[PDB]
Amino acid sequence: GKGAAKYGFKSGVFPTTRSILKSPTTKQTDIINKVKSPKPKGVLGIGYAKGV
Amino acid sequence: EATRPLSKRKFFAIAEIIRNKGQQFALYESEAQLSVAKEEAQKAKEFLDKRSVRENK
RNA sequence: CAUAUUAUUAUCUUAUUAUUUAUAUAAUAUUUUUUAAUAAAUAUUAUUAAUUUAUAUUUAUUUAUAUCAGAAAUA
RNA sequence: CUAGAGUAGCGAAACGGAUUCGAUACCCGUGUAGUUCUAGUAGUAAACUAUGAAUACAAUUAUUUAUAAUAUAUAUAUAAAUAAUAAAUGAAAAUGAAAGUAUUCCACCUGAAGAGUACGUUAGCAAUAAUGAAACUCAAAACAAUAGACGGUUACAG
RNA sequence: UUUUAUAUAUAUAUAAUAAGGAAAAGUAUUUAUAAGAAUAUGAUGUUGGUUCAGAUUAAGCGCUAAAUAAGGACAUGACACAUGCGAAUCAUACGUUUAUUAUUGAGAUAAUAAAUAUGUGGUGUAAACGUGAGUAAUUUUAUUAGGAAUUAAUGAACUAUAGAAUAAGCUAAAUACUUAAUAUUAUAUAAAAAUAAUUUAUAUAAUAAAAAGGAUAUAUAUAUAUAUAUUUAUCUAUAGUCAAGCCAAUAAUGGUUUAGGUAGUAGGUUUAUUAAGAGUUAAACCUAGCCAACGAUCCAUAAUCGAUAAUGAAAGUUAGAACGAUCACGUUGACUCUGAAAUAUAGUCAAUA
Ligand SMILES: [Mg+2]
Ligand SMILES: [Mg+2]
Ligand SMILES: [Mg+2]
Ligand SMILES: [Mg+2]
Ligand SMILES: [Mg+2]
Ligand SMILES: [Mg+2]
Ligand SMILES: [Mg+2]
Ligand SMILES: [Mg+2]
Ligand SMILES: [Mg+2]
Ligand SMILES: [Mg+2]
Ligand SMILES: [Mg+2]
Ligand SMILES: [Mg+2]
Ligand SMILES: [Mg+2]
Ligand SMILES: [Mg+2]
Ligand SMILES: [Mg+2]
Ligand SMILES: [Mg+2]
Ligand SMILES: [Mg+2]
Ligand SMILES: [Mg+2]
Ligand SMILES: [Mg+2]
Ligand SMILES: [Mg+2]
Ligand SMILES: [Mg+2]
Ligand SMILES: [Mg+2]
Ligand SMILES: [Mg+2]
Ligand SMILES: [Mg+2]
Ligand SMILES: [Mg+2]
Ligand SMILES: [Mg+2]
Ligand SMILES: [Mg+2]
Ligand SMILES: [Mg+2]
Ligand SMILES: [Mg+2]
Ligand SMILES: [Mg+2]
Ligand SMILES: [Mg+2]
Ligand SMILES: [Mg+2]
Ligand SMILES: [Mg+2]
Ligand SMILES: [Mg+2]
Ligand SMILES: [Mg+2]
Ligand SMILES: [Mg+2]
């Protein structure tokens, strides 16, 4: 009963709604640009360095 | 950084070295040894020379 | 001192199974060398069943490894 | 306690003398270990300020104590020790530059008894030291202070 | 103050001088909400425990009890089970059996009716249901806008599209089984960049892996075949949907009076196996490592959780019955076939009854 306060006081659960499109579409320019953008270099980034 | 399982307990791999302090700590060690040897030799030569001067007196 | 149950093992025994060895006048398929029984025509010539032969798929047999579970020892 | 040496006094234990209803005690005598030195073991005390360490701040007075001056005199200034306090804090006693106002870290406590006991483990030559419960019983248990009673409690008077 | 004067050696001592005065009327939502009491004491204050006032239950019991409506109902022995049911269905897969009519002469074949699921076959029982023994994590639970090895020429079973559905054998016959025919990856060339690799296109290599017919009608011809059409089936390919396999991070009870533990142990290099990484398993060769007083290893206990239940002002605490999610199990242990996925409530072996 307590935890329901987080979820709008609704008791019970619905199954998680499924996404019709599992992967992003090619018309989403922003997602492609973020994907294609140069990866941040170094440790605050996400990728292996040039020499390593 | 996350990686495929490479062993029972290893699941990460290094990607880059922001700070090379550990690398420098050995280069400086060897350089210090080499420089200390020659500086020792020079100062020992000076001390021997001074001993010779006081022997002459 | 006595009873009990899990766990293990440089020990003993081992169902079944998994690989792994070696053997089969062992089979079955097909490939030969051949023997009988049979079919059409003017000595046959081929056919099916059995003989020998060497490639597969297994069966019996045993070599090793592991292995349920049981004892023996320990905790 | 373990080895050596030492051993004048003192003195566990022991042996006797007194006292006592009884003396196993206080008093008295002889007095062993020990106290002493060297080389070790051990790591416990009411090992106490019953008050861990560090930092910033916090109103006075009085002494000293230690420096720095200025000419014994400036009842000279700067520090710390000590004593009494203000505020503050505290159950109060009381603390008083910490028991105050704050910050940081560590150790410790969760009713009395059972109990620092049992069992186990670690270390020591050993005595022992460290760590350390549980069941059961109970509504108790303790601290400060108040007013009494009491003391083989003091002094003053009559 | 500031500036300047005189005097004295840029500076020093004395004296004078000072710019800061502006005025005016009118122009709620406040939030969340924590109460103590009795018992010490000769009496007082404080520490301190004990008990009580509230709510609730998977409840039990004593006394009592009218009806209706709804929600629950072996928490303990995962102890043993008499008895009846809980998984069948298809006659349009193949076979059988009858009865009538017709032609053919004990039967034969058609048409029409039926029976036949004690014969051969297809589909369904990996689900649902119940349970909580094991499990403190070596594969379990929760969570992430987490990943890759950058997961298979996997469809399980529906949708959308295209194709194909051939021959023999053995079954008594087949949509039963075998044999056969036919229908992504690895290389090479370039391209780019989301690049120190991946992707894209091409060209080859092999992909190369299948199938099945029934029920009706008709149309041909010569009962036999055949050819269509309608229905229901079969196989392959692409995509979708639903799904699976593996790993990462954080959290998950008590006892160190369990202080050392670990030798596949920690890591490296290869090989076998998988769709797939890895001492996961099997083999080989190297290094000496790995965890641990922020608690290893060992032991005991326990299914886990929620937008579930109880309680509290709340943080939290307890439960895990009921509703829901995950896991594990179907008397116990191991292994094997099938399969995409099972150590299956299957099979084999053993243990118990
Ligand atoms: Mg590796
Ligand atoms: Mg001595
Ligand atoms: Mg003496
Ligand atoms: Mg004496
Ligand atoms: Mg006495
Ligand atoms: Mg005496
Ligand atoms: Mg001594
Ligand atoms: Mg010492
Ligand atoms: Mg002591
Ligand atoms: Mg002490
Ligand atoms: Mg103390
Ligand atoms: Mg106090
Ligand atoms: Mg002791
Ligand atoms: Mg009372
Ligand atoms: Mg109550
Ligand atoms: Mg009911
Ligand atoms: Mg039950
Ligand atoms: Mg239950
Ligand atoms: Mg039929
Ligand atoms: Mg049948
Ligand atoms: Mg199931
Ligand atoms: Mg269920
Ligand atoms: Mg046929
Ligand atoms: Mg078939
Ligand atoms: Mg490997
Ligand atoms: Mg391992
Ligand atoms: Mg090995
Ligand atoms: Mg532990
Ligand atoms: Mg359990
Ligand atoms: Mg359980
Ligand atoms: Mg439930
Ligand atoms: Mg629980
Ligand atoms: Mg139930
Ligand atoms: Mg099972
Ligand atoms: Mg089982
Ligand atoms: Mg049963």
From Swiss-Prot, chain A:
Subcellular localization: Mitochondrion
Coiled coil: none
Main function: Component of the mitochondrial ribosome (mitoribosome), a dedicated translation machinery responsible for the synthesis of mitochondrial genome-encoded proteins, including at least some of the essential transmembrane subunits of the mitochondrial respiratory chain. The mitoribosomes are attached to the mitochondrial inner membrane and translation products are cotranslationally integrated into the membrane.
Note: Present with 2010 molecules/cell in log phase SD medium.
Family stated for the protein in its record: Belongs to the mitochondrion-specific ribosomal protein mS26 family.
Quaternary structure, from the entry: Component of the mitochondrial small ribosomal subunit (mt-SSU). Mature yeast 74S mitochondrial ribosomes consist of a small (37S) and a large (54S) subunit. The 37S small subunit contains a 15S ribosomal RNA (15S mt-rRNA) and 34 different proteins. The 54S large subunit contains a 21S rRNA (21S mt-rRNA) and 46 different proteins.
Protein name: Small ribosomal subunit protein mS26
UniProt source species: Saccharomyces cerevisiae (strain ATCC 204508 / S288c) (Baker's yeast)
Swiss-Prot record, chain B:
One record GO biological process: mitochondrial translation
Subcellular compartments: Mitochondrion
An annotated GO cellular component: mitochondrial small ribosomal subunit
UniProt entry keywords in alphabetical sequence: Mitochondrion, Ribonucleoprotein, Ribosomal protein, RNA-binding, rRNA-binding, Sporulation
MF GO annotations: rRNA binding; structural constituent of ribosome
Domain of life: Eukaryota
Family statement: Belongs to the universal ribosomal protein uS17 family.
Miscellaneous notes: Present with 2810 molecules/cell in log phase SD medium.
Subunit structure: Component of the mitochondrial small ribosomal subunit (mt-SSU). Mature yeast 74S mitochondrial ribosomes consist of a small (37S) and a large (54S) subunit. The 37S small subunit contains a 15S ribosomal RNA (15S mt-rRNA) and 34 different proteins. The 54S large subunit contains a 21S rRNA (21S mt-rRNA) and 46 different proteins.
Function field: Component of the mitochondrial ribosome (mitoribosome), a dedicated translation machinery responsible for the synthesis of mitochondrial genome-encoded proteins, including at least some of the essential transmembrane subunits of the mitochondrial respiratory chain. The mitoribosomes are attached to the mitochondrial inner membrane and translation products are cotranslationally integrated into the membrane. uS17m may have a meiosis-specific role as it accumulates during the middle stage of sporulation.
Protein name per Swiss-Prot or TrEMBL: Small ribosomal subunit protein uS17m
Organism whose genome encodes this protein: Saccharomyces cerevisiae (strain ATCC 204508 / S288c) (Baker's yeast)
Upper taxonomic lineage: Eukaryota, Fungi, Dikarya, Ascomycota, Saccharomycotina
Whole-protein residues included: 61 to 117 of 237
